[PDB]
Amino acid sequence: SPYILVLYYSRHGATAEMARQIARGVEQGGFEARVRTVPAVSTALYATLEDLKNCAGLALGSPTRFGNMASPLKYFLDGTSSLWLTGSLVGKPAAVFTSTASLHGGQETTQLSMLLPLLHHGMLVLGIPYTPYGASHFAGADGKRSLDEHELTLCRALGKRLAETAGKLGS
Amino acid sequence: SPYILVLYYSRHGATAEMARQIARGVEQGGFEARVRTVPAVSTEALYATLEDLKNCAGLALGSPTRFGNMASPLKYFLDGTSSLWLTGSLVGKPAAVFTSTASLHGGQETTQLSMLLPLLHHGMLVLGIPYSEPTPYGASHFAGADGKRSLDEHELTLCRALGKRLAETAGKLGS
Ligand SMILES: [Mg+2]
Ligand SMILES: [Mg+2]
């Protein structure tokens, strides 16, 4: 019944596949996983505020977009003022994940930039113990490079760690 | 003539006022300014174009704080800049950031830092406020709970100083 929410935006599918692997880890850690995405903006089922409020913990995923998360996922988060005011997410564990099609960095700082809203919401932030900051993946120039053994193992480990931490906090 | 683009998003007006004050500083620094905003987004004052950004000599980027990152409409505009990235259109141009917040619980400095990230990914030369001259990361403003608190003297002075600095830096680079 309690669940970890695996919330992501994907353009070409890499973060969607990461989200599925994180969800598999969540299950290894004895929790249900709820995998949701967000719609495109302009001038998996879609996540709601209730999904986010009622999660036991959160994995937040995006492709890198110039060192920050993608604007559709930022738009979802921009709608969370009520949660912030009422302390809805305070004390829940949270982690992040990214994918990049670029050869010259950006994931670590993107991940760091994504930790910021989680901390604004009073979440308990965690990453991958001995990047440390979240799960990473290189998607190749075409965005379709499969997760390698390491990348996949770390996605599952992150999901399992969110679930196990939620388990500890919940009793 | 060369211009500094002052590019921002504003929901309740504070960053729009900051943008205008930054532009006044740009003028003090001997450059033209172009002040431009971006439209609201949803699921599925003049608006900036990619040409405005591509052809600027420097950039001041402004947003209200939104959970420690810039506002999504401004992120959406920046997400549209891949062609400029490929053509190195912002490389070596000076840049700075500015923010407003309606909250007392903080977040402006790290929001500013988070905003420097796309500018560094575009190869810009990033600068802030040097406080030694008679945050270091950009200009700030507290907007009040309703977001209607005016810029005070200090805040106005710092916005102008940032614009002047950006302009003077672009002046030095351009000869
Ligand atoms: Mg316990
Ligand atoms: Mg010179």
- CA–CA dist B82, B92 (Å, integer): 17
Residues whose Cβ atom is located within 5 A of ion ligand 1: A 168
- Would strands B42-43 and A41-42 be described as parallel, antiparallel, or unpaired? antiparallel
- CA–CA dist B158, B143 (Å, integer): 15
**Radius of gyration over alpha carbons of chain A, in Å?**
15
- CA–CA dist B1, A96 (Å, integer): 44
Residues facing B37 on adjacent strands: B8, B47
- CA–CA dist A121, A85 (Å, integer): 9
- Would strands A32-37 and B32-37 be described as parallel, antiparallel, or unpaired? unpaired
| Chain A contact present for B42, CB below 8 A | yes
H helices of chain A, where? 14-28, 49-53, 71-78, 81-86, 107-120, 149-170
Question: With helix as H, strand as E and coil as C, how does chain B read?
Answer: CCEEEEEECCCCCHHHHHHHHHHHHHHHCCCEEEEEECCCCEECCCECCHHHHHCCCEEEEEEECECCECCHHHHHHHHCCHHHHHCCCCCCCEEEEEEEECCCCCCHHHHHHHHHHHHHHCCCEECCCCCCCCCCCEECCECCCCCCCCCCHHHHHHHHHHHHHHHHHHHHHHC
Question: Which amino acid belongs to residue B163?
Answer: G
Domains held by chain A: number: 1
Question: Which amino acid belongs to residue B89?
Answer: S
Residues of chain A with Cβ-Cβ distance to B44 below 8 Å are 39-42
**Are B59 and B31 contacting, i.e. CB atoms less than 8 angstroms apart?**
no
Say which CATH number the domain at A114 has.
3.40.50.360
b/e sequence A117-156, b meaning 16+ C-beta within 10 Å: bbebbebbbbbbeeeebbbbbbbeeeeeeebeeebbebbb
Q: How many CA atoms lie within 13 A of A4 on its CB side?
A: 35
Question: B118 and A75 in contact by Cβ < 8 A?
Answer: no
Question: With helix as H, strand as E and coil as C, how does A13-24 read?
Answer: CHHHHHHHHHHH
**Are B41 and A75 contacting, i.e. CB atoms less than 8 angstroms apart?**
yes
Question: B118 and A66 in contact by Cβ < 8 A?
Answer: yes
- Taking alpha carbons only, the member of A96, A94, A97 closest to residue A123 is A94
> Which residue range forms the structural domain that includes residue B123?
1-175
Ligand number nearest CA of B169 is: 2
Mutation target vs A (from B38, B41, B44, B120; most A CBs, 10 A cutoff): B41
